[PDB]
Assembly symmetry: C3
Homo-oligomer: 450 residues x 3
C-alpha cells in the first residue's frame, strides 16, 4: 500500500517574533522543514505535500520539486491545514502521516515504525506518543484495557488521576488516508480559538468504533516542537548531543562535544579527531585519520584519509589524502586538491584543480586553474582570471616553479619544468624547460639618503 | 530633590592577586567600575564621586570627566571611603546612593527604584536587599512589625532563628545625604579589623529613631561582588546569560548561548543570527536579518540590515546593507563600507570609504582612501599610504577596474571607468576612461632549463 | 633505595574502536602514555619500563630514550604484562610502581606519596585507593582492624555489607620489587577471561602474611582510566577543570573556563587575560599582563610581559615584551620577535629574527631573515628565500623602509636607513643610506577606453 505525508508549514509563528516563516529557521544549517522533509522521505513515503501560506516562495524555493504544495489562505488550525491537501490526496489510498514543519528532530526510524505499527494493526489512525517527566498541558494518552487508545484527554478536561499520566500525544499521527479525509469534513471549530484541531479526527474515529493505535517513541526529544528562539537553540543543542554521541560511539574523537557542531548528514571515519569549535554541515564525507583543527567550518565537502584542516573555511570542495590546509585558508566551491598537497596560510582556492604534490604555501589566489603535479606556487602569486566581464583559465604544468608575487594573466599556459622569475607579470605562454622573466632590473642610488 | 552617587573604587583587592586596582578588571570588555558608573548615571544621578587610592591614574583615566574623584590614603573601610567624598558632597541635599565598584551587574532599573522607594518613604536610609538560597555569612535583614528595618544582624551575632533568614543586605544603600555625613562622624573602628563599616551608620540612624527602609531586588545576581578571578568569570557568565536571554526574547537567533558573548550596550534587530563563538562588545548597533558568522569579534560598530560578517574582526567600523565581509577580514577604525559591498578574505580596510557596490575581494590593504561606486579592486592591490612620516590619501573613481598586484602610491587620483593593468605601480593621476600600465614586458628564454 | 616504574601500554584497546594503540590517543595535545611517563619521572623514579605490543614503533617513537621497552606478544592480562619487564627489572631492588598508560590524569604528587607511604611502612605492596560515589563493579578496599589491607573484594564476591564500601582500588600499586617478581611466578590464569590479573599478587602477598598497605588519594578523578572516546573527552574536561582552576587561583583571568584549553606544562604570569576559545599547549611560558585573544592557538612558545596575541597561530616561537601579533597572523617555528614589535594581519614569520621596534604590518612573509631595529616592512613584501633546492638568508638593517610589494631575492643584504621603492624586486645588496628601485615607469593611455 502507498504512503503519503503532509507537512504543516503555514502557521503564523507569532511566538518566533520573526518576519520569516517559522519552519524556515535553521537547525544545523538547514531549515526545520527540510529536516522534516528528509525524515519523511527517508521513511519510505511515496508523495509529500507541504501546506504553505501566503508569500511561501521561500519555502517552495527551498524544497523545490521534492514536495507538492497546497496553499492555506487563513491559519485556522492543524485540521484545516490538512484539509488544504485534498486536491493532491483526497482520492489516494494507503497510509498518510501528518508532521509539523517545526519538529526538526523527528527521526526517519521513528516514522518508519509509526507507519509499520499502523499498517500491521490495520488501524484507522495511530498516535505517536512519548513519556515526559513534566506532562502539564499536553494531551494525555488514555488507553483502554486492550492497550489501544481510549482517548487523548486535554489538561483542562482531565481528572486528577489522568493528570498523573506521563504518556502524552506528540501531535504526530498516521491515518488511513480515506478515513482521514472523510472525517475532516465533520471536524468543527466550536471552541475559543475558533480553530479546527487535528486530534478531533481521532475522537470522531473512536466515536464510530474505529481502531486507533498508539506507538510510543523512546526518545522524547525527537518530538520537540520549536515555537521560539529559546526552543530553537534547545533543538540545536539536542541535535548536537545526538550526532556527537553517534560519532564518538563509532571511533571519532571529539575533544569538546559542547562546542562542536556536526550536522546530521555528515559521515566521519574512525580515528579522526575533531578539535573544539569545529562546525561541519551539509553533505560532508570525512575519511579516517583526519584532523579537523579548531574553529574550522566545513560545508558540503569531501576530506580524504589523513588530511589536516587547520582553522580554515571549506565549502563544496574536495581534499585528497594526506593534504594539509591552513591555518587561515579558504577553499571555495570547486576547489579540488589532490593528495599530498599543501595549501598554506592566507591562500584562497576557487574552481581550481591542484594535482598531487602541488604546493601553494602562502598569500595567494588560485582561481579557474589547473596546477600540475609537484608544482610550487610562490608566495603572493595570483591567477588573474577576471577581465570584468568573463573568467579565463590558467594552466600550469608539472614540476614547475612559479616565483613569488607573479601575476599569471589568463588565458595563459605554463609548461613543465618552468621557472617563472619572482615579480613577473606573465601574459604569454611559456614552453617546457624555459625561464620567463618580466620585471625591471634594479637601480641602486648609493648615498641618496645621506 | 537632587541625587548623588558615591562609587567605592579604592580597595586593595588582595583576593584578586593583581597589581591593578580590582575595579579595573573587565566584564564584557569594560572595567567593572565603568559598568557601575553607567548604571548610576542611568539611574538619574546628578553628581558622581568615585573614591580612588594611590596610583589611581588608570581609574581616573578611564572614567574621565564623567565622575569627580576623592582620594582615600589608607584603606580603612567602606565608611571611611565614603567620608573621603566630604569635599564634594558634605553640604549637598537630597539622596545619595553608595555602590561598590566591584558590583558590575547592578542594573539602572534597580537603582532607580531603590532611590524612588527611599524618597517616597521619606526615609533616612534604605538598604537594598535580596533573597539568597545560602545566606551564611551575610548580614540578615531583620524587619520590625511595620515592615521597615529593625536591624541588619551579622552571622556572628544572630540567634539560630535569625540565621534561618534568607533576606540579606546587599551592601548597597540610599541615604539622606545630610544625615549620612552627620552620622559618619560617629562611626567608630572599635573592632578586630580596625575598620569603619558603612552599615554602622544604619544602626546609628536606628538608635536615633530614624526611619530605615528596605527595598528588595528580585535578581540576586545583580548584587554579586567580585573579589577573585573565579567570581570574575562568574560575573562574565551571569552577564552573558542576561543579555543572551534578552536578545532571544526579542527575535534574535543565538545558536549557542553558552559560547556567545554580547555586551550590555549592543542592540540587535530581529531575525538576525548570531553564530557560535561570536563576541560583540562596545556600543554596537546591528540591524535586522544580519548574520554574524562564527568566531567573529565586533566592537563599537554599526552593521546594517542583511549584512553578512564571516569569521572577521571589526572595530569602530560601519557596514552598509547587504554587504559581505570575510572570512578572515579585518575592518579597522574608520572603515566605512557602503551597501552591497564585498570585502573578501585576507583584506584589511582602515580609514577608507568603500562606496556602494565596490568590491575588494582578496589579499588587499585599503587605507586612507575612497573607492568609488562599483569599482573592482583586484587581488593583491595596496594603497601605499605611508612614507614613514605622514599618511596620504588615495582616490579611485567609479566603475573602475584596478588590476591585481597594483600599488597605488598616494597621493594619487584614479578616474572613472579606468583600467589599471595588473602588476603596475601607479605614481601619477590617471584620468577617466584611460588605461594605465607600469610593468616590464615578458622575456621568455625558451629551453633555458633543458 | 631505588625506584622503578612499569607503564602498561600494550593492550588491544578494543573499546576505543581505533587502529592505533589506546595510549597514543591524546589529552591536551599529548599521548596519554606521555602524561603518565611525565608523572612517573616527576615522582623520582630511577628507571621506567614501558610494556609495548606489536607494531609499537609509534609508542617507542614518542617516548624515545626516556623509557626502556619490553614486548608483550599476546595480551594475557596486567600481571602477564608486568612479567614482560623481567629482563630489565627482575634483579633490581627497591620500590616499583605499576601504572596503566591510559590513566593520564595521575599526578606526580600522588605517586610521590604512594611511594613514600609504601617505603615508610616497609610494606610488601601498597594499593592506591580512592572514594567514589558509585563503586559498583570496582574492587572494594576491605581493611583489617589495624587499618592495612585485608583484601580487595570484587563485586561478584562481595557480601551486601561489602558492596556498601565506597573505597575502591585504583589498579595502581607500589611493590617491593623482589617480592613482585617472586609472586608473579605463582599467579594463575584460572578464570573466564584466561587472564593473569595483577591484583592477584596482593592476595598472594597477604596469604603469606606480608604487609599490604593502602594509600588513599583525595582526587578520584586522577585515577580515571580511559577506555573509549566518551571517556577521552571526559579526561580532556577533567584536565581543563584542573588547570583552569589552578591558574585562576594564581592571578590569571580566564573569561570562559569551559572553552579555554591550557595544557599541564604551561606557566602563566599574573594579570594575564585568556580570552574564550584559546588553546595553549606544549611547554609554553607566558609572562605577566599578557592578553591572549580569542580563538588563538599557542604551542611550545615564550610570550613575554605585556604582549598581545589576537586570533593567531603560534608554534615554537618567542614574542618579546609589549609586542602585538595578529589578528590572523602565524608565527612558525624559529620566529623570534623582539620587544615593541608589530606583526599585523595575514603575516607569516618563519625562522626569522625581528629586532626591537620592527614592524611587519600586513600581508607579508618573512622567512630565514633578520629584520633590524625599527625597520618598517611594507604591505605585500616577501623574503624570497627558496630556490627549489635550498633556502637562503635575507638581512635588513636598522631604521630602514622596505616598500610595499617588494620581493627581496635572497641571499641579499639591505643596509641601514635604506628606502626600497614599492613594487621593486631586489636582487643586489643595497648599502646604507641608499634608495633602491626596480620597477617600470608608468604609461598612461589617456582616453584609451573612451
Ligand atoms: C630571475 C632569477 C630566476 C635569476 O636568478 P639567477 O639565474 O641566479 O641570475 P642571472 O643573472 O644569472 O639570470 C639568468 C638569466 O636571466 C636574465 N635576466 C635576469 N634578470 C632579468 C631581468 N629583469 N629581465 C630580463 N632578463 C633578465 C639574465 O640576463 C640571464 O640571462 P642570460 O643567461 O641570457 O645572460 C631569480 O632572480 C629569481 O627570480 N628567483 C625566484 C625564486 C622564487 O621565487 N621561488 C618561489
Ligand atoms: C595590460 C592589459 C589590460 C592589456 O591586455 P590586452 O589589451 O588584451 O593586450 P594589448 O597588447 O592589446 O595591450 C593594449 C595596449 O597596452 C600596451 N601595453 C601593453 N602592455 C604594455 C606594457 N607592459 N607596458 C607598456 N605598454 C603596454 C599595448 O602596447 C597596447 O597599446 P597600443 O594599443 O597603443 O598598441 C592586461 O594584460 C591586464 O593587465 N589585465 C588585468 C585584469 C585584472 O587584473 N583584473 C582584476
Ligand atoms: C620611488 C619613491 C620612493 C620615489 O618617490 P619620490 O622621491 O617622491 O619621486 P622622484 O621622482 O623624485 O624619485 C626620486 C629619484 O628616483 C628616480 N626614479 C624614480 N622612479 C624610478 C623608477 N621606476 N625607476 C628608476 N628610477 C626611478 C627618480 O628619477 C629620482 O632620481 P633622481 O633624483 O636621480 O632624478 C616612491 O614612488 C615610493 O615608492 N614610495 C613607497 C613608500 C612605501 O612603500 N612605504 C611602505
Ligand atoms: O493553521 C495552521 C496552524 C499551524 N500550522 C503549522 O502546524 C504546526 C504547529 O503549529 P504551531 O502552533 O506550533 O505554530 P504557529 O504558526 O501557530 O505559531 P504561534 O502563532 O502559535 O506561535 C506549525 O508547523 C505550523 O506551521 C499550519 O500550517 N496552519
Ligand atoms: O577601604 C576601602 C575598602 C573598600 N573599598 C571598596 O569597597 C568595595 C568593597 O570592598 P571589598 O572588600 O570587596 O574589596 P577589597 O579591596 O577590600 O579586597 P580584599 O582585600 O578584601 O580582597 C570595593 O570596591 C573597594 O574598592 C574602598 O574603596 N576602600
Ligand atoms: O594484556 C594487557 C592488558 C592491558 N594492558 C594495558 O593495561 C592497561 C589497562 O588495560 P585496559 O583493560 O583498560 O585496556 P585494553 O587494552 O585491555 O582495552 P579493552 O580491549 O579492554 O577495551 C592499558 O593501558 C593496557 O594498555 C597491557 O599492557 N597488556
Ligand atoms: O621555508 P618555508 O616557508 O617552509 O617554504 C619554502 O619552501 C617551500 C617548499 O615546499 C615552498 O613551498 C615555499 O614557497 C617556500 O616559502
Ligand atoms: O572568480 P572570483 O574569485 O569569484 O572573483 C573574480 O570576479 C570578481 C567579481 O566580483 C572580482 O571581484 C574578483 O576580483 C575576481 O577574482
Ligand atoms: O596606517 P596604518 O595601516 O596604521 O600603517 C601604516 O603606518 C605604519 C607605521 O607603523 C606602517 O607599519 C604600515 O606599513 C602602514 O601601512
Ligand atoms: Mg603582492
Amino acid at each position: 500500500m502507498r504512503r503519503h505525508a503532509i507537512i504543516l508549514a503555514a502557521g503564523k509563528g507569532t511566538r518566533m517574533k520573526s518576519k520569516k516563516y517559522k519552519v524556515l529557521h535553521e537547525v544545523a544549517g538547514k531549515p526545520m522543514v527540510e529536516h522534516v522533509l528528509e525524515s519523511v522521505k527517508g521513511s519510505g513515503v511515496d508523495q509529500v505535500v507541504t501546506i504553505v501560506g501566503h508569500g511561501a516562495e521561500s519555502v517552495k524555493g527551498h524544497l523545490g520539486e521534492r514536495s507538492l504544495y497546497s496553499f492555506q489562505e487563513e491559519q485556522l488550525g492543524t485540521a484545516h491545514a490538512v484539509q488544504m491537501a485534498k486536491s493532491h490526496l483526497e482520492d489516494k489510498e494507503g497510509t498518510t502521516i501528518v508532521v509539523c514543519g517545526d519538529t526538526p528532530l523527528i527521526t526517519k526510524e521513528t516514522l518508519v515504525t509509526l507507519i509499520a505499527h499502523h499498517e500491521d494493526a490495520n488501524a484507522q489512525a495511530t498516535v505517536l506518543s512519548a513519556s515526559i517527566q513534566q506532562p502539564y498541558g499536553y494531551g494525555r494518552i488514555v488507553r483502554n484495557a486492550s492497550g489501544r487508545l481510549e482517548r487523548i484527554v486535554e489538561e483542562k478536561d482531565a481528572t486528577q488521576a489522568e493528570k498523573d499520566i506521563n504518556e502524552i500525544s506528540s501531535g504526530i499521527f498516521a491515518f488511513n488516508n480515506k478515513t482521514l479525509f472523510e472525517k475532516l469534513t465533520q471536524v468543527k471549530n466550536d471552541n475559543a480559538q475558533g480553530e479546527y484541531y487535528l486530534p478531533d479526527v481521532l475522537s470522531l474515529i473512536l466515536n464510530d468504533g474505529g481502531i486507533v493505535e498508539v506507538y510510543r517513541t523512546n526518545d522524547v526529544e525527537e518530538i520537540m516542537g520549536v515555537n521560539d528562539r529559546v526552543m530553537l537553540s534547545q533543538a540545536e543543542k539536542a541535535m548536537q548531543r545526538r550526532t556527537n554521541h553517534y560519532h564518538m560511539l563509532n571511533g571519532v574523537t571529539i575533544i569538546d562535544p559542547d562546542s562542536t557542531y556536526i550536522g546530521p548528514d555528515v559521515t566521519i571515519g574512525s580515528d579522526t579527531v575533531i578539535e573544539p569549535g569545529v562546525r561541519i554541515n551539509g553533505r560532508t564525507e570525512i575519511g579516517e585519520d583526519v584532523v579537523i583543527g579548531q574553529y574550522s567550518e566545513i560545508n558540503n565537502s569531501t576530506i580524504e584519509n589523513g588530511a589536516c584542516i587547520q582553522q580554515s573555511v571549506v565549502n563544496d570542495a574536495s581534499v585528497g589524502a594526506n593534504t594539509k590546509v591552513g591555518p587561515f585558508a579558504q577553499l571555495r566551491p570547486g576547489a579540488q586538491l589532490g593528495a599530498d598537497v599543501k595549501v598554506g596560510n592566507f591562500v584562497e582556492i576557487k574552481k581550481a584543480d591542484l594535482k598531487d604534490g602541488a604546493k601553494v604555501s602562502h598569500l595567494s589566489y588560485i582561481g579557474d586553474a589547473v596546477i600540475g603535479e609537484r608544482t610550487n606556487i610562490g608566495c603572493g602569486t595570483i591567477t588573474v582570471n577576471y577581465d570584468g566581464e568573463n573568467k579565463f583559465k590558467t594552466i600550469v604544468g608539472k614540476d614547475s616553479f612559479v616565483g613569488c608575487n607573479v601575476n599569471l594573466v589568463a588565458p595563459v599556459t605554463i609548461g613543465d619544468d618552468v621557472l617563472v622569475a619572482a615579480g613577473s607579470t606573465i601574459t604569454d605562454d611559456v614552453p617546457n624547460d624555459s625561464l620567463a622573466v618580466a620585471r625591471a632590473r634594479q637601480t641602486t642610488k648609493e648615498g641618496y639618503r645621506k
